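Input for the complex:
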Amino acid sequence: SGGGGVDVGDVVSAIQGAAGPIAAIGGAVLTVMVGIKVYKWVRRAM
Amino acid sequence: SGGGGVDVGDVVSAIQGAAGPIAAIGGAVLTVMVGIKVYKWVRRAM
Amino acid sequence: SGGGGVDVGDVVSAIQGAAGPIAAIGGAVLTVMVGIKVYKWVRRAM
Amino acid sequence: SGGGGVDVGDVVSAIQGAAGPIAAIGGAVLTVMVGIKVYKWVRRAM
Amino acid sequence: SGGGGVDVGDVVSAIQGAAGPIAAIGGAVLTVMVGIKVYKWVRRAM
Amino acid sequence: SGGGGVDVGDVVSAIQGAAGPIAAIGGAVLTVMVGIKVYKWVRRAM
Amino acid sequence: SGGGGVDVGDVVSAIQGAAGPIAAIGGAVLTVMVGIKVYKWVRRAM
Amino acid sequence: SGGGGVDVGDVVSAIQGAAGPIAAIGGAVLTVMVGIKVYKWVRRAM
Amino acid sequence: SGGGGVDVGDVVSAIQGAAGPIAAIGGAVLTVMVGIKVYKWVRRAM
Amino acid sequence: SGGGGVDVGDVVSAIQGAAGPIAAIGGAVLTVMVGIKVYKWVRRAM
Amino acid sequence: SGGGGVDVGDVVSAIQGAAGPIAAIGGAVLTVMVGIKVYKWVRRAM
Amino acid sequence: SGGGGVDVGDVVSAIQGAAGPIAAIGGAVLTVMVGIKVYKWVRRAM
Amino acid sequence: SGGGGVDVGDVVSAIQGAAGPIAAIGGAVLTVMVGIKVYKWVRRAM
Amino acid sequence: SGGGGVDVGDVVSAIQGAAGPIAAIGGAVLTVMVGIKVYKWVRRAM
Amino acid sequence: SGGGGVDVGDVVSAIQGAAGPIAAIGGAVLTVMVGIKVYKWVRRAM
Amino acid sequence: SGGGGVDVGDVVSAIQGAAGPIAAIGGAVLTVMVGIKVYKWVRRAM
Amino acid sequence: SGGGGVDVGDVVSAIQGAAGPIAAIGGAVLTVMVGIKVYKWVRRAM
Amino acid sequence: SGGGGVDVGDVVSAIQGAAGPIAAIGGAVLTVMVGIKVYKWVRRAM
Amino acid sequence: SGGGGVDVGDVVSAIQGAAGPIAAIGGAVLTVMVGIKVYKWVRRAM
Amino acid sequence: SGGGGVDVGDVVSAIQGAAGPIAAIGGAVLTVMVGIKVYKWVRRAM
Amino acid sequence: SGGGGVDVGDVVSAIQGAAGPIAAIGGAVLTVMVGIKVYKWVRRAM
Amino acid sequence: SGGGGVDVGDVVSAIQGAAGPIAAIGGAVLTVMVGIKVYKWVRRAM
Amino acid sequence: SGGGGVDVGDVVSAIQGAAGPIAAIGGAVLTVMVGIKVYKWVRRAM
Amino acid sequence: SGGGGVDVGDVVSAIQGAAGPIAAIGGAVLTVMVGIKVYKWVRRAM
Amino acid sequence: SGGGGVDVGDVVSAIQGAAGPIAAIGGAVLTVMVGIKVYKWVRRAM
Amino acid sequence: SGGGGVDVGDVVSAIQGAAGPIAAIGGAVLTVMVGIKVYKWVRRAM
Amino acid sequence: SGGGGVDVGDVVSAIQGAAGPIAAIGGAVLTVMVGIKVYKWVRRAM
Amino acid sequence: SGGGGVDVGDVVSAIQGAAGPIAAIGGAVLTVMVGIKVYKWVRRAM
Amino acid sequence: SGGGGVDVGDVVSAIQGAAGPIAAIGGAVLTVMVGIKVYKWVRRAM
Amino acid sequence: SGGGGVDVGDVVSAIQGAAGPIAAIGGAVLTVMVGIKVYKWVRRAM
Amino acid sequence: SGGGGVDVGDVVSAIQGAAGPIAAIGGAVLTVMVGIKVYKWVRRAM
Amino acid sequence: SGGGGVDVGDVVSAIQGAAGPIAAIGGAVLTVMVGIKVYKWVRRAM
Amino acid sequence: SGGGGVDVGDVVSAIQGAAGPIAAIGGAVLTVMVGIKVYKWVRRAM
Amino acid sequence: SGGGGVDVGDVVSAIQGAAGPIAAIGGAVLTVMVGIKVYKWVRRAM
Amino acid sequence: SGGGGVDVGDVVSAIQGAAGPIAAIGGAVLTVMVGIKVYKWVRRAM
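Predicted:
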């Protein structure tokens, strides 16, 4: 009950929760990466 | 009967039962982990 | 909270932020690239 | 700051800057190309 | 500096410079072309 | 130097030079053309 | 049942679902890209 | 018989069975991923 | 929802939106290009 | 004879025999695991 | 905003603007070309 | 400014300027052409 | 359906539609071009 | 069967199907492009 | 709408409009050309 | 025999078999992709 | 002799032998994987 | 002498000797394991 | 069928059809041109 | 066999087949184009 | 031998073999493409 | 000696040897791939 | 001395020595792996 | 003194001393192990 | 052999062959054109 | 040797060899094209 | 020494060496490609 | 000292040293790869 | 130093050096091309 | 040396050499063209 | 040799040869033209 | 400090430094490439 | 406190700190890589 | 109470507490690791 | 004091100290590994 259920419950919320901000880096990384290539496609179509 | 059968029975239900929440962390960990890579595949396909 | 939320937050701002200047190279690269072809279209229309 | 902002800044100035002389070839190429055709239009109007 | 500025500089001088003789063909071509028609206008005015 | 200057130089001499004989046809054509009309003016003045 | 079936089900809907907007960028990117070249083909056909 | 055969049997059905939905995420992930690149190939062929 | 839908939405508006000015260069490039050839057709029809 | 030979004989058949189903989980686990990655290689080759 | 709108704006003004002088060559070329033929029509009407 | 305005400016002055002497041939050609026909009109009016 | 059918539909109407005015320049260009030559044929037939 | 055969089947119909409208842009683009040149050939033949 | 319709509209008015003065040269050229031949017909009819 | 030979056999047939439909997407993708460029080559040859 | 030599011998033949079919999945997986990319290279070369 | 030296001697030869075939499983296991990954690297390099 | 056959069919009828009126200008141009020369032949035969 | 041979076969018949009507535009375009010049040669020979 | 030599052998024959029909599309595409331009060269030479 | 030297020796010959046919697919793949583009370059040069 | 020093010495020479052939597989594996990709880069550069 | 101090002293020197060669196997094992993976990283980077 | 030699052979016969009728228009055009001028020379010689 | 030297050798002979017939179309195309213009020059010289 | 230096040495000679014939295809491809366009430039200059 | 410092030192020199020849393959691979594309750019510029 | 500086140095001299003869084809191509048109201008001026 | 220098050398001799006969058509075309006009000038001077 | 020399040779003989009959029209045209004026000179000298 | 800072520092200077000569190939490649096209533009303007 | 907090603190500063120079290689690598392609885009736009 | 409850309590706070800084290294390690790859993705998108 | 404190102290200095050279292999391994890929990125950007 205590250790098993409750603590493991904390594992779920804390782990995937703290991982949310990790996915946030994903969004920010995407802003830049597609950014440099919009530059790449422009130069294609100069 | 008592100590052997009953107590060991408790071992089964309590141990694999408390382990259920452990598997729950597994699900939560999965939400995040695949999350950061959906970010990785996007940047591939920028 | 600390490591997850805050640090990942830094990942977002620092990564896509530092990527901004990367996009800047994109603009500068564009100035030159279209430049050499305005030269190409002139010679077409000599 | 350093790597991202400063270095990328260098990318802009160095890349589109070095490209300037590339556009210079454009001007020089134009002197010749229109030159051979002023010859072409003269022969039209012999 | 080196590759960009200097080499591109060479592009300008070498390209439009080598094109000068191309324009020379223009002058020589003109000597002949108007030549055959001075023949054409004479025959008009026989 | 080689391709540009020398070869183009050849263009000039070869083109306007070979055109010289073209102008020669002009002289020969003139002998005949004025010839038929000296015939035309005689018949005017019969 | 729970973790396997249900959670994985969420993976499908959440992942390919969130990816829909990613494809939306595709449409928007297309508006611009073909746009710059309609400009390129016009200049061909000036 | 009981623990070995039966329980292990459960391992097979439960594990690869619960994994089925995991493969489902695979299908859903595929819908999105190829989606963003149909966008990439269009922009190639603008 | 957040990262997927909202951020990707931003991708669409920001990317094809910033591309609008790219198409603007298209219009401006067209003014010049057709300009030099109106010059070319005049000289045809001298 | 009895305890040593016979009982130990039972150990062999019962232990490695009950272990057979354990290997069965191995097969079932394999169905799923390779399954999720056929998904991974598809997304590589999107 | 910055890179997209502003820089592309510069593309328009700089490109079609620098092209203006290109059209100027058009006017100057026209002065000469019609010039040599006013000579051609005079000789027609000798 | 430099390449566009200045160089194109050179195009105008150099092209229509060098064309001036081309028009000079026009004047010289006219001296001869009308010359041969003053001969033609005399013979009319013998 | 949405992205493919609808957006591409927009491509058709927007692209060939915006191209209509491009053809309009064609008509206007024609007014002028034939105009300068009606001048050319008159001078033929002076 | 399910994921492989059925889902991939959807890939075929959805992808090449959604691509149909892409080809539609092709037809519309063609209406305009040939349009501007019918204008180009007219001006040739003024 | 903007780039396509409006800008192309400008193409029409600006191009055929600027061409009007080109036709003006046509009128002026005609004054002279017929002028020199009224001289030619007089000398016929001396 | 069982797990090794038979199950692995299933791996072969199921994996490369389910992959067949994946190749089917390849054919369908090809119909569209070449489709948009037949449009590209037409506009070249307008 | 018995347990050591003979049984271990069985380990070799049974383990690497049962692994053969595992390599078979390798061949089958290869048929599909290269299959989807022959599709990828075609679309490159559309 | 007897029990100590001789019997222990037997321990050495019998134990590490019977272990030889154990190492044989090692070789056989290696044939398979590297086998499945030659399959993995091929699919990388498809 | 649709895009290829039908649309191209439209190309034929629309293009050579719209060209009919172009030929109409031909007739009208002819009325004037022969007109000015009936004037030229009269003055010959005054 | 299926995807390769059959589908590619479809590529041939569908592509060059749909291109037939494209050539049809060629015939129709020819009717008009030669049409406007029969007008041009008449005015030569007024 | 089996997997390596034989299967890879199949790769060669199946891949470049199925590619043959791909080249067939090449021939068919060529029939059309040169077709539309025989139309282009005719209109040049109207 | 046995397991180490001999077996590993087999690894070398068997692995890079079986890989030879893999390279064979490379040759066959090349026949097709360059094949489809000889088609691409022809259509360029139609 | 005996067991410790001598036997352990044997461990060193026998273990890293037998491992040499393991590295040999490394060389052979490399021949093949780079082989299949020289095929991959050729097809890039077809 | 004798048994305790002296003999135990021997334990230290003999035990950790004889263990030195054991660590020697460690070095030799390391030569091989990193060896096989330098092979693994090469194949990554093929 | 097939695609290259045979198909290209078809190109020759089909292209220059279909061009024969194009030359036929040449003959027919000649009948008319010289026709209108036999009219022109008659009126000269009224 | 085999794949590299021999196969590439085949590339040379097969590619430039199959291209020979492509050049044949060139000759045939030339027969027609000059044909239609011998018609054009005749009508000049009617 | 052996594996590293010698084998890698083989990589250099074998890889860039086998690539030589690849460049040979380049020469052969060039014979054909320029061949078809000498045909293209002739038809320009018919 | 011995095992740690000395042996690890050997790791550095032996590993990055043997890797030098690996980089040598890099140079040789580069000779070929750029080689095939100098062929690609020539055919562009045929 | 070695691979980078020296080998790349070879790239420069070998690539632009081998390209010299490519420019030589340019000169030779020019001899012919202008040749066929000196023929074209003669026929203009017959 | 080989591919670059030698092959390109062949380009020069083969291309401008094969072009010689092209110039031959020029001479032959000239015989006819001036021929039809000697007919034109005779009829002038009837 | 073949295409260049032989085919161009055919150009010469076929073109100037077929032009012979064109000159024949010249003779026939002359019979008539001088014919109508022998009528003109008679009426002068009535 | 040592490994991190110093060695990585070496990475920067050695990598981008050795890359300098790579850019040198860029300059040399440019000399040739523009060279072959100055040949292409000359033949345009023959 | 000591081992946990302090030492781990050192881990953070030392690890990500020493990694800074690793990112420095990133900047230097970028200088070169974009460098070789500015060369690639120039040759595109030659 | 004392030893069990209190001391174990200390185990929890001290162990997971001292582990906090261990996770701190995780954050710092992440700063660097993603750092070197932002460098990797830039070079992809150069 | 002696055994605990002093000896364990030796453990720290000796273990992490001897590990320093282990990290040295890390630096050396890095020189090579990035080396082979600078080769990989060059071939990308050939």
